[PDB]
Design an enzyme around this catalytic site. Structure first.
Site, PDB file in Angstrom:
ATOM      1  N   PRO B  28      29.439   0.391   1.150  1.00 48.11           N
ATOM      2  CA  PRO B  28      30.066   1.611   1.091  1.00 48.11           C
ATOM      3  C   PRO B  28      29.217   2.553   1.043  1.00 48.11           C
ATOM      4  O   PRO B  28      28.074   2.616  -0.094  1.00 48.11           O
ATOM      5  CB  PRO B  28      30.697   1.346  -0.605  1.00 48.11           C
ATOM      6  CG  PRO B  28      30.972  -0.119  -0.303  1.00 48.11           C
ATOM      7  CD  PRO B  28      29.635  -0.942   0.327  1.00 48.11           C
ATOM      8  N   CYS B  30      29.101   7.207   0.868  1.00 46.51           N
ATOM      9  CA  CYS B  30      29.593   8.716   1.236  1.00 46.51           C
ATOM     10  C   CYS B  30      29.059   9.034   2.606  1.00 46.51           C
ATOM     11  O   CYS B  30      27.855   8.800   3.296  1.00 46.51           O
ATOM     12  CB  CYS B  30      29.297   9.590  -0.139  1.00 46.51           C
ATOM     13  SG  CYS B  30      27.286   9.558  -0.079  1.00 46.51           S
ATOM     14  N   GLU B 103      36.353   0.716  -0.772  1.00 46.40           N
ATOM     15  CA  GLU B 103      35.470   0.343  -2.208  1.00 46.40           C
ATOM     16  C   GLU B 103      36.556   1.065  -3.302  1.00 46.40           C
ATOM     17  O   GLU B 103      36.269   2.250  -3.240  1.00 46.40           O
ATOM     18  CB  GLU B 103      34.127   1.100  -2.132  1.00 46.40           C
ATOM     19  CG  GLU B 103      33.279   0.771  -3.373  1.00 46.40           C
ATOM     20  CD  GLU B 103      32.023   1.426  -3.383  1.00 46.40           C
ATOM     21  OE1 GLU B 103      31.927   2.748  -3.301  1.00 46.40           O
ATOM     22  OE2 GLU B 103      31.017   1.027  -3.645  1.00 46.40           O
ATOM     23  N   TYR B 169      34.660  -2.035  -7.645  1.00 49.01           N
ATOM     24  CA  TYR B 169      33.473  -1.092  -7.690  1.00 49.01           C
ATOM     25  C   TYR B 169      32.845  -0.991  -9.157  1.00 49.01           C
ATOM     26  O   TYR B 169      33.499  -0.343  -9.772  1.00 49.01           O
ATOM     27  CB  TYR B 169      33.606   0.227  -7.147  1.00 49.01           C
ATOM     28  CG  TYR B 169      32.256   1.062  -6.926  1.00 49.01           C
ATOM     29  CD1 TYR B 169      32.623   2.481  -6.659  1.00 49.01           C
ATOM     30  CD2 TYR B 169      31.110   0.836  -6.989  1.00 49.01           C
ATOM     31  CE1 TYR B 169      31.418   3.455  -6.497  1.00 49.01           C
ATOM     32  CE2 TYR B 169      29.894   1.685  -6.765  1.00 49.01           C
ATOM     33  CZ  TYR B 169      30.131   2.989  -6.577  1.00 49.01           C
ATOM     34  OH  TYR B 169      29.366   3.799  -6.447  1.00 49.01           O
ATOM     35  N   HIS B 172      26.824   2.016 -10.185  1.00 49.97           N
ATOM     36  CA  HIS B 172      26.702   3.516 -10.342  1.00 49.97           C
ATOM     37  C   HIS B 172      27.531   3.850 -11.720  1.00 49.97           C
ATOM     38  O   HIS B 172      28.158   4.911 -11.780  1.00 49.97           O
ATOM     39  CB  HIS B 172      27.025   4.341  -9.366  1.00 49.97           C
ATOM     40  CG  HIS B 172      26.245   3.831  -8.016  1.00 49.97           C
ATOM     41  ND1 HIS B 172      26.706   3.562  -6.918  1.00 49.97           N
ATOM     42  CD2 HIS B 172      24.942   4.036  -7.587  1.00 49.97           C
ATOM     43  CE1 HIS B 172      25.912   2.994  -5.891  1.00 49.97           C
ATOM     44  NE2 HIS B 172      24.694   3.323  -6.409  1.00 49.97           N
ATOM     45  N   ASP B 267      18.682   3.405  -6.943  1.00 45.24           N
ATOM     46  CA  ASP B 267      19.234   2.650  -6.084  1.00 45.24           C
ATOM     47  C   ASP B 267      18.864   3.266  -4.598  1.00 45.24           C
ATOM     48  O   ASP B 267      18.318   2.344  -3.917  1.00 45.24           O
ATOM     49  CB  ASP B 267      20.752   2.587  -6.369  1.00 45.24           C
ATOM     50  CG  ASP B 267      21.421   2.195  -4.869  1.00 45.24           C
ATOM     51  OD1 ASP B 267      21.208   1.172  -4.228  1.00 45.24           O
ATOM     52  OD2 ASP B 267      22.819   2.664  -4.838  1.00 45.24           O
ATOM     53  N   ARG B 322      21.575   3.803   4.283  1.00 44.01           N
ATOM     54  CA  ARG B 322      20.943   4.525   5.198  1.00 44.01           C
ATOM     55  C   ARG B 322      20.410   4.533   6.368  1.00 44.01           C
ATOM     56  O   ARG B 322      20.219   4.917   7.361  1.00 44.01           O
ATOM     57  CB  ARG B 322      19.622   5.297   4.238  1.00 44.01           C
ATOM     58  CG  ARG B 322      20.351   6.549   2.977  1.00 44.01           C
ATOM     59  CD  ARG B 322      19.174   6.700   1.899  1.00 44.01           C
ATOM     60  NE  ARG B 322      18.669   5.377   1.519  1.00 44.01           N
ATOM     61  CZ  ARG B 322      17.740   5.324   0.649  1.00 44.01           C
ATOM     62  NH1 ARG B 322      16.761   6.513   0.344  1.00 44.01           N
ATOM     63  NH2 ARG B 322      17.273   4.140  -0.025  1.00 44.01           N
ATOM     64  N   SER B 400      12.655  20.099  16.495  1.00 39.58           N
ATOM     65  CA  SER B 400      13.240  20.745  17.270  1.00 39.58           C
ATOM     66  C   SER B 400      12.764  20.497  18.799  1.00 39.58           C
ATOM     67  O   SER B 400      13.614  20.071  19.562  1.00 39.58           O
ATOM     68  CB  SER B 400      13.387  21.990  17.040  1.00 39.58           C
ATOM     69  OG  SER B 400      12.445  23.014  17.299  1.00 39.58           O
ATOM     70  N   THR B 420      -0.047  23.207  21.816  1.00 42.17           N
ATOM     71  CA  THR B 420      -1.510  23.287  21.503  1.00 42.17           C
ATOM     72  C   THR B 420      -1.919  22.142  20.464  1.00 42.17           C
ATOM     73  O   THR B 420      -3.056  21.551  20.715  1.00 42.17           O
ATOM     74  CB  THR B 420      -1.763  24.804  20.778  1.00 42.17           C
ATOM     75  OG1 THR B 420      -0.852  24.569  19.634  1.00 42.17           O
ATOM     76  N   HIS B 427       4.887  20.750  12.470  1.00 41.47           N
ATOM     77  CA  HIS B 427       4.350  20.898  11.091  1.00 41.47           C
ATOM     78  C   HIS B 427       4.737  19.573  10.302  1.00 41.47           C
ATOM     79  O   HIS B 427       4.355  19.309   9.208  1.00 41.47           O
ATOM     80  CB  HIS B 427       5.343  22.034  10.537  1.00 41.47           C
ATOM     81  CG  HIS B 427       6.495  21.714   9.968  1.00 41.47           C
ATOM     82  ND1 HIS B 427       8.034  21.676  10.946  1.00 41.47           N
ATOM     83  CD2 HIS B 427       7.303  21.542   8.774  1.00 41.47           C
ATOM     84  CE1 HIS B 427       8.780  21.080  10.338  1.00 41.47           C
ATOM     85  NE2 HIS B 427       8.565  20.981   8.943  1.00 41.47           N
ATOM     86  N   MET B 470       0.773  28.961  25.264  1.00 38.06           N
ATOM     87  CA  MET B 470       1.533  29.377  26.526  1.00 38.06           C
ATOM     88  C   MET B 470       1.659  30.925  26.027  1.00 38.06           C
ATOM     89  O   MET B 470       1.897  31.255  24.663  1.00 38.06           O
ATOM     90  CB  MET B 470       2.793  28.846  26.522  1.00 38.06           C
ATOM     91  CG  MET B 470       2.915  27.200  26.986  1.00 38.06           C
ATOM     92  SD  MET B 470       2.472  27.021  28.417  1.00 38.06           S
ATOM     93  CE  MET B 470       3.907  27.417  29.549  1.00 38.06           C
TER      94      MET B 470
END
Ligand SMILES: *c1c(C)c(C)cc2c1nc1c(=O)[nH]c(=O)nc-1n2C[C@H](O)[C@H](O)[C@H](O)COP(=O)(O)O
Ligand SMILES: Nc1ncnc2c1ncn2[C@@H]1O[C@H](COP(=O)(O)OP(=O)(O)O)[C@@H](O)[C@H]1O
Ligand SMILES: Nc1ncnc2c1ncn2[C@@H]1O[C@H](COP(=O)(O)O)[C@@H](O)[C@H]1O
Ligand code: SF4
Lengths: 233, 608, 189
Positions: B28, B30, B103, B169, B172, B267, B322, B400, B420, B427, B470
């Site tokens: 489970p 979010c 959950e 549950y 947490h 966690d 994740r 990007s 270059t 970055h 460029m």
């Protein structure tokens, strides 16, 4: 003045390729492109051309129609002219037979300098360039990491890249055959407009008869070794 | 093809009345959809079901309005409306052959109830240490029976909604855990005191839920087996293991975590602090006593680490949150041996940061289609193919430009990407060299790998690095049909800042005693002993430079005109970051900014 | 008959690959009666007799030339002369930068068996079989050399193990063909 760069279109294999007969990998698993060392060769010729006044850079390759794609990339990357040598009887020509073939087109071309890559990415014979030097009877140096040469000089200074990074300066008579190592320069990338213009250019086709060779001079039959078997180790 | 040692990950496993098809399980989590964005919920979970995940779970799912997390967004299963909304997800997950789980959540005083305005109930009255203005009413016996009945009614709704898996549950530090844990539970009746008494609430809840839906649904429980707080809360070898033994006969599958709610980055460990597998020492303690299937999350993305925990007998199932967000198709990619296609989670916790802020949809640093599957129609692995031979030039290969190249090449376009820089990543290459951030490099590693493989199959495309910059003329003459400019940003060199939007007098990073982040990260410009960092940014740069500099022996003071590391509260990094700065002796001056600088000195002011 | 090893040296020191090649040559003999000749080439190559007087070596020929260290024209001339004089069945060179300078020239003239970067060698009855890589080392390629009385191989370094201990080889010296090379070695960098 003319610099002739021999280039090879190399095969790269897809995962998980299959051995076909046991004599080669199956073709379906093969992708072809310009040998990595040939970008550096070609760039060095372009450096020489760009450092003076008037130098024809010609690229030459021994292989079938598909090679046209790699010679086109050379045109896009600066080469003035592209030549392709072929006859179906030349299939399976080993590094030494290809050296003989290249020698006879080089004689037809009559250049001032020959550049080859140190080795090919696919078979890594590290033999073809220096076989060419032997048939031409030209001074030669292998594994060149630096080149001081001005067009029309008698006389060039190279550095050999030895094991462990160490370099050796060598003065060499010209005309010479040099095999060029990774890292000698920074090969350029053509732009989309460069590529489009390269597309209009002819690839000159040259047969064995054109260079005084025949089916009996080339192919697997005339080679210095014979493949028994390929296998995944 | 797939490594034969990974075959174990594709074996089924029984959980009560249901069968998991493989060992890949989305615990489970979010996403910012709950029962309020049924499109997003059904698309996000169903892409993963298509991607090979054996089970997909909603996020925490409120059983009743007196557990309302507003301003944060939870799922809800309060009534028939919610049953219709969530059934969109169960139907869609089933279409791809996965199980769907829910959950069941009741937060006690941790739910601030800002929508419902109802009063939460708890084992004893406390103000939540996370929501510090939110208090609960102490439960009498009828209250306990009433809240238990809420769980039962929600579990019956869940079966109506088509769920295969129903959790009680208790991680947490939510309600079953609150009764378990004497940090919250101060009762002296038969629900307080001894372990048996403290477990009674969670055990009765499990028995009631199993009784109501157990013939039809696997009953799972999520358990914070150790609060990682020392004695005074739950510890795995004290109450943890003993609780598992008491509850083992009621549970079809154990789902194990560590930590509390205020610091739940213990966690969802940020890569800044924790490697893959960081939870193993606590998690493996459960199989030492349980006879039931067990999982415990640990940022698992590598199949080599996955078979390790299963063959050694530390877990039966690979739970992920994740990793499944970064790559909904991780299991299919392992199944097919396409390891180099796996998009590996960097543990930045930007996904969580959205949830924490309260209300916005999830986003993901690796996976730019997370949150976009439904509303933009963006599938992470399917790309509309161009019908023309248009070419695109892309100047800059940072996150990007490199993403744009990757997607355009997957879409069949001719692309020429140029920079270059010597390597892809822009970055991010210096950022990932900051202390603790090495795993952030996976974002550019993935793109470097993918771009290299796309060039082999898109033959007119090209990558050029280490290039001359460029110019406008170079672009105009380049020969592309479309051009994308992705040239990045730089840190300011004249003091320009969000407070005054103007330069600061005397600020100039060309001076030998002043530096930008890039000059610090480059490492060439000499730095003196006493360092002041002047900060108007609320995310990671200033704290990370302070860490780097103090660890290299400088005496560091941070003068901050904004709340230092505010955004790290949302990534859950904030608590260990502050501990790290404290143990390195970094001094902080909050609520000050700077009116002028001179050689070796600066004038500061209190913002109030 | 005979196996010819071409040793290798640089800046005063024998390169260990030389011993590995003796290793390979000895493991390759078709009988205790076959003989390994090692050659070391250079204007000061007599200095290497101690380092090359090692187990497995039956003859050590020192060849002195124009160059102290490697030069392609000298080496080609010297090795062709060793081969013609010792008529070896197999000649073993290191796969080394120096060898890239001339190995394939030796073969082009002659019709000798030739293969490079060899990591397995074996006789199968009376036919030499060499294995090298293919397709960027993704396959092994086994080759043989039909009706070739002399095969020249370059050998991958760090593959064949050196023999242990000293030997008692018959040392000889010879001069290189005094022909002037078309290149000149200058300094190391
Ligand atoms: C929300 C967010 C986006 C994150 C990634 C985790 C998370 C979220 N909400 C959760 C909730 O609704 N219930 C719950 O039980 N757990 C929730 N999580 C935590 C998550 O389930 C995992 O425990 C951690 O993310 C650690 O696992 P992993 O990401 O290392 O695999
Ligand atoms: N004129 C230019 N030509 C080529 N590359 C450029 C030019 N200007 C900037 N760049 C490159 O653009 C990239 C921008 O990357 P980055 O700062 O990470 O931006 P983003 O986060 O938007 O992807 C850098 O790698 C930089 O070297
Ligand atoms: N078929 C070929 N056509 C033209 N040049 C070749 C060919 N094969 C090899 N070469 C040259 O030899 C180089 C090194 O390869 P090799 O000795 O084949 O491993 C290449 O870079 C080319 O210069
Ligand atoms: S936002 Fe970061 S931590 Fe979250 S799933 Fe994406 S890459 Fe991983």
């Amino acid at each position: 003045m003319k610099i002739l760069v021999a280039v090879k279109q190399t095969a790269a294999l897809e995962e998980d390729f299959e051995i076909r007969d046991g004599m080669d990998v199956d073709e379906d698993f093969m992708m072809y492109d310009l040998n990595e060392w040939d970008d550096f060769s070609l760039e060095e010729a372009m450096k020489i051309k760009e450092s003076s006044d008037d130098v024809e850079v010609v690229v030459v390759s021994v292989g079938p129609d598909r090679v046209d794609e790699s010679l086109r990339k050379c045109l896009a990357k600066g080469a003035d002219r592209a030549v392709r040598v072929w006859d179906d009887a030349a299939e399976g020509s080993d590094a030494i037979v290809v050296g003989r073939i290249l020698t006879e087109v080089i004689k037809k071309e009559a250049p001032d300098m020959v550049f080859a890559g140190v080795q090919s990415s696919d078979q890594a014979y590290a033999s073809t360039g220096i076989s060419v030097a032997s048939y031409l009877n030209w001074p030669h140096a292998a594994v060149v990491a630096d080149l001081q040469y001005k067009p029309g000089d008698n006389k060039a200074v190279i550095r050999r890249e030895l094991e462990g990074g160490m370099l050796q300066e060598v003065e060499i008579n010209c005309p010479a055959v040099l095999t060029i190592q990774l890292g000698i320069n920074k090969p350029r990338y053509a732009s989309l407009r460069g590529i489009k213009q390269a597309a209009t250019k002819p690839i000159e086709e040259v047969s064995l008869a054109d260079i005084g060779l025949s089916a009996n001079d080339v192919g697997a039959a005339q080679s210095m070794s014979r493949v028994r078997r390929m296998y995944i180790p | 093809a797939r490594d034969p040692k990974h075959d174990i990950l594709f074996e089924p496993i029984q959980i009560g009345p249901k069968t998991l098809r493989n060992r890949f399980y989305q615990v489970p989590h979010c996403i910012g959809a709950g029962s309020d964005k049924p499109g997003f919920q059904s698309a996000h979970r169903s892409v993963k079901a298509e991607g090979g995940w054996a089970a997909l779970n909603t996020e925490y799912c409120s059983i009743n309005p007196e557990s309302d997390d507003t301003h944060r967004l939870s799922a809800r299963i309060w009534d028939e409306g919610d049953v219709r909304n969530l059934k969109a997800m169960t139907d869609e997950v089933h279409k791809y052959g996965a199980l769907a789980g829910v959950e069941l959540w009741y937060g006690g005083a941790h739910a601030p109830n800002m929508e419902s305005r109802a009063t939460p109930r708890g084992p004893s009255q406390y103000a939540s240490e996370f929501e510090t203005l939110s208090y609960c009413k102490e439960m009498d016996l009828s209250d306990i029976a009433q809240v238990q009945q809420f769980y039962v009614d929600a579990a019956k709704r869940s079966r109506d909604a088509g769920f295969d898996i129903v959790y009680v549950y208790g991680a947490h530090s939510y309600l079953p855990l609150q009764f378990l844990n004497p940090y919250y539970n101060k009762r002296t009746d038969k629900y307080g005191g001894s372990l048996e008494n403290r477990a009674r609430f969670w055990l009765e809840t499990l028995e009631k839920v199993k009784h109501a839906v157990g013939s039809d649904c696997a009953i799972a429980t999520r358990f914070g087996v150790d609060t990682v707080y020392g004695p005074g809360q739950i510890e795995a070898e004290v109450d943890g293991q003993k609780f598992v033994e008491m509850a083992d006969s009621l549970v079809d599958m154990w789902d194990i975590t560590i930590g509390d709610i205020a610091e739940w980055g213990e966690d969802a460990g940020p890569s800044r602090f924790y490697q893959q597998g960081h939870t193993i020492p606590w998690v493996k303690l459960v199989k030492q006593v349980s006879k039931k299937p067990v999982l415990g999350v640990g940022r698992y993305t590598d199949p080599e680490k996955m078979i390790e925990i299963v063959t050694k007998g530390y877990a039966d199932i690979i739970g992920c949150a994740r990793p499944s967000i970064a790559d909904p198709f991780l299991p299919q990619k392992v199944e097919q041996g396409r390891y180099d296609d796996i998009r590996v989670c960097i543990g930045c916790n930007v996904c969580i940061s959205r949830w924490e802020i309260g209300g916005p949809p999830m986003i993901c640093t690796q996976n730019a289609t997370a949150g976009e599957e439904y509303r933009r129609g963006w599938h992470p692995e399917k790309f509309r193919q161009t019908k023309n031979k248009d070419s695109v030039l892309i100047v800059g290969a940072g996150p990007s430009g490199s993403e744009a190249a990757r997607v355009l090449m997957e879409s069949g376009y001719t692309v020429h990407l140029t920079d270059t820089a010597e390597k892809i990543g822009g970055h991010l290459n210096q950022v990932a060299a900051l202390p603790g951030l090495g795993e952030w490099s996976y974002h550019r590693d993935y793109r470097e790998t993918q771009i290299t493989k796309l060039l082999k199959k898109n033959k007119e495309s090209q990558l050029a690095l280490g290039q001359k910059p460029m110019t406008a003329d170079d672009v105009l003459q380049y020969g592309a049909d479309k051009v994308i400019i992705a040239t990045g940003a730089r840190w300011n060199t004249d003091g320009t800042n969000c407070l005054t939007h103007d330069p600061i007098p005397g600020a100039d990073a060309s001076l030998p005693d002043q530096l930008t982040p890039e000059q610090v990260m480059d490492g060439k410009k000499k730095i003196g002993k006493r360092v002041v960092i002047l900060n108007a940014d609320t995310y990671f740069m200033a704290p990370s430079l302070a860490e780097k500099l103090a660890t290299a022996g400088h005496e560091v003071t941070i003068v901050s005109g904004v709340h230092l590391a505010n955004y790290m509260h949302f990534t859950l990094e904030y608590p260990n970051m502050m501990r790290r700065l404290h143990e390195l002796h970094v001094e902080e001056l909050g609520d000050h900014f700077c009116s002028r600088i001179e050689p070796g000195r600066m004038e500061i002011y209190n913002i109030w | 008959s005979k196996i010819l090893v071409i040793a290798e040296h640089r800046r005063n020191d024998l390169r260990p690959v030389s011993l590995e090649l003796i290793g390979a040559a000895n493991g390759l003999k078709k009988s205790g009666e076959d003989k390994v000749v090692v050659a070391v080439i250079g204007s000061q190559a007599d200095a290497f007799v101690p380092a090359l007087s090692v187990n497995g070596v039956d003859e050590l020929v020192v060849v002195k030339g124009s160059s102290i260290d490697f030069d392609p024209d000298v080496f080609e001339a010297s090795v062709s002369a060793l081969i013609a004089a010792h008529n070896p069945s197999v000649v073993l060179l290191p796969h080394s930068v120096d060898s890239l300078g001339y190995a394939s020239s030796l073969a082009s003239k002659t019709g000798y068996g030739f293969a490079t970067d060899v990591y397995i060698v074996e006789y199968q009855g009376d036919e030499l079989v060499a294995t090298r890589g293919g397709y960027n080392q993704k396959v092994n390629v086994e080759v043989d050399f039909p009706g070739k009385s002399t095969v020249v191989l370059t050998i991958r370094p760090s593959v064949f193990k050196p023999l242990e201990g000293a030997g008692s080889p018959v040392v000889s010296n010879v001069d290189a063909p005094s022909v002037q090379s078309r290149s000149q070695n200058k300094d190391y960098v």
